[PDB]
Amino acid sequence: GIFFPALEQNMMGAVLINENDEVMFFNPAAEKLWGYKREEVIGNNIDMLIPRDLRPAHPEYIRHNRERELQLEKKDGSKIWTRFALSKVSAEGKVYYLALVRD
Amino acid sequence: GIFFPALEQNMMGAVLINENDEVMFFNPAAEKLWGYKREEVIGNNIDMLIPRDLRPAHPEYIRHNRERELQLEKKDGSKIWTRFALSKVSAEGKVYYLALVRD
């Protein structure tokens, strides 16, 4: 029972997307980085977390992989630089991705 | 649920210690970083993972907190530089720590 608390209480932002690119987990550190409360994010397509100017390209990148210093755009349109760590998580016969993000 | 695979399959080394500083989780990325298999680590004390020259000082730092670019020393004695991210995790009244580590 300690795996969920270890991610929930992580000092890094944690974002898990499912096989249809919907956000399934979004922790309080991620709420602070993006300016969204998790209730606004869960169950929605990852697109809402992607900077507006990368929404054309980003789906092709995920699709290609299914087959880093990054600039994050907040809810209010302001931007911050982050470090992203991505892991591909194979479970339940599905491919999930976990992003671990820090300022 | 999904929170175990998200840490088990993480590209970052992940080390979880319990309230007694015993290692309770040590993923394959951490095995590669330190050169220990998890059977050599689980149930053992945190100090087996601390470089010998930091074993005098490290216990007082954990104690103080209970009450980063770091040089890791592998099983074979070689050393590598890492980045550590620590989180304090409270669950069921007990304090755990999770280290996420990368080369």
Ligand code: HEM
């Ligand atoms: C601030 C939000 C994000 C930004 C700015 C962003 C940016 C990018 C960029 C620019 C790439 C193309 C490759 C590269 O790094 O050069 C990429 C690839 C990728 N992104 Fe994101 N991303 C964001 C969020 C996420 C999230 C939340 C996830 C999944 C939880 C994710 C999953 C992926 C994957 C799987 C790829 C392809 C992996 C690969 O590089 O093979 N991204 N992203």
Ligand code: HEM
């Ligand atoms: C290569 C192994 C490690 C080295 C070289 C290392 C080194 C250090 C050093 C130099 C400090 C004192 C200064 C500082 O806070 O930066 C520190 C504090 C600490 N370390 Fe480690 N450590 C290692 C592994 C771990 C692991 C695996 C854990 C727990 C999973 C851990 C838990 C802590 C805690 C809880 C503190 C006190 C943090 C604070 O006061 O904010 N360390 N460590």
